[PDB]
Design an enzyme around this catalytic site. Structure first.
Site, PDB file in Angstrom:
ATOM      1  N   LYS A   1       3.093   6.728   5.021  1.00  0.00           N
ATOM      2  CA  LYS A   1       2.282   6.287   4.524  1.00  0.00           C
ATOM      3  C   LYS A   1       2.318   4.431   4.421  1.00  0.00           C
ATOM      4  O   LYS A   1       3.892   4.500   4.594  1.00  0.00           O
ATOM      5  CB  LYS A   1       2.003   5.992   2.654  1.00  0.00           C
ATOM      6  CG  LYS A   1       1.066   5.063   2.421  1.00  0.00           C
ATOM      7  CD  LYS A   1      -0.488   5.263   2.297  1.00  0.00           C
ATOM      8  CE  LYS A   1      -1.020   3.983   2.182  1.00  0.00           C
ATOM      9  NZ  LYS A   1      -0.928   2.880   3.049  1.00  0.00           N
ATOM     10  N   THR A   2       1.766   3.760   5.435  1.00  0.00           N
ATOM     11  CA  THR A   2       1.991   1.976   5.781  1.00  0.00           C
ATOM     12  C   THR A   2       2.143   0.834   4.396  1.00  0.00           C
ATOM     13  O   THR A   2       1.039   1.669   3.859  1.00  0.00           O
ATOM     14  CB  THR A   2       1.222   1.609   6.906  1.00  0.00           C
ATOM     15  OG1 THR A   2      -0.728   2.469   6.609  1.00  0.00           O
ATOM     16  CG2 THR A   2       2.326   2.463   8.334  1.00  0.00           C
ATOM     17  N   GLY A   3       2.517  -0.012   4.711  1.00  0.00           N
ATOM     18  CA  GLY A   3       1.674  -0.781   3.960  1.00  0.00           C
ATOM     19  C   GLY A   3       1.632  -2.257   4.455  1.00  0.00           C
ATOM     20  O   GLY A   3       3.009  -2.432   5.405  1.00  0.00           O
TER      21      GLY A   3
ATOM     22  N   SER B   1       1.219  -1.180  -0.081  1.00  0.00           N
ATOM     23  CA  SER B   1       0.069   0.279  -0.193  1.00  0.00           C
ATOM     24  C   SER B   1       0.897   1.584  -0.263  1.00  0.00           C
ATOM     25  O   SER B   1       0.523   1.917   0.050  1.00  0.00           O
ATOM     26  CB  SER B   1      -0.788  -0.106   0.926  1.00  0.00           C
ATOM     27  OG  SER B   1      -2.111  -0.817   0.952  1.00  0.00           O
TER      28      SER B   1
END
EC number: 3.5.2.6
Length: 261
Positions: free
Chosen positions: A207-209, A43
């Site tokens: 922003k993580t994923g 992501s």
């Protein structure tokens, strides 16, 4: 040095593969660990798609107000915002915010489709001088994170450089850059990752994923007190398909590499 030794030990203890790229914008010094190796973005790739739409809005001032229909058939595996708008509409601004702040995979697919497909997200990266980033698939399959699969990958160094260019450098015009930073600062999924290894007084946009193979990612711009920003990419992955997510490893890496500020 002792920082490098600590990262090596953290990786050894984890059972997996750790990628770190820290850029200190005070002097453009770097702390790198496996920073030229490929990792599935999962992501974290959504930053590139949202930024591409922001770029378009430089030539169409009101593009972010344009509405997109959400249908039941659009829903994929993780749709916290889009599922609330089925048989209604979301603006492109709402889709950007949903993609980045809530990690809505349907919102990401709407951004991908708007742009003309994964190849066009890649083409935008190329326009920023990023020759490393590649987006190949839509949601949800772009998160498979299979070892040795080049699809939907980048390196920690390429992503840190690009995130720096997007949020602090000349990739976007000012209003659009500021919009991207506002979105990232409003993230709702990043408190256990990079943020957790940093002093509470510091401002962070991230922003993580996550993905299969216990893939656990975070990319961040960090504003420390009384100092120039830092840009940090922490990518982590494991050799087994069903390994558990390890956000604590990213927090630990973030703490190791940010002392002295």
């Amino acid at each position: 040095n002792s920082v490098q030794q600590q990262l090596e030990a953290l990786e050894k203890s984890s059972g997996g593969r750790l990628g770190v790229a820290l850029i200190n914008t005070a002097d453009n010094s770097q702390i790198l660990y496996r920073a030229d190796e490929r990792f599935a973005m999962c992501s974290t790739s959504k930053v590139m798609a949202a930024a591409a739409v922001l770029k378009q809005s430089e030539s169409d001032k009101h593009l972010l107000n344009q509405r997109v229909e959400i249908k039941k058939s659009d829903l994929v595996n993780y749709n916290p915002i889009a599922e609330k708008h089925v048989n209604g509409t979301m603006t492109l601004a709402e889709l950007g915010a949903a993609a980045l702040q809530y990690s809505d995979n349907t919102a990401m697919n709407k951004l991908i489709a708007h742009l003309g497909g994964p190849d066009k997200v890649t083409a935008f990266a190329r326009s920023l001088g990023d020759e490393t980033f590649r987006l190949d698939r839509t949601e949800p399959t772009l998160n498979t994170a299979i070892p040795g699969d080049p699809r939907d990958t980048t390196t920690p160094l390429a992503m840190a450089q690009t995130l720096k260019n997007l949020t602090l450098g000349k990739a976007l015009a000012e209003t659009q850059r500021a919009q991207l930073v506002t979105w990232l600062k409003g993230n709702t999924t990043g408190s256990a990752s990079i943020r957790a290894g940093l002093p509470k007084s510091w401002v962070v946009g991230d922003k993580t994923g996550s993905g299969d193979y216990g893939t656990t990612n975070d990319i961040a711009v960090i504003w420390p007190e009384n100092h120039a920003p830092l840009v940090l990419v922490t990518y982590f992955t494991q050799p087994e398909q069903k390994a558990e997510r390890r956000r604590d490893i990213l927090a630990a890496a973030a703490k190791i590499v940010t002392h002295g500020f």
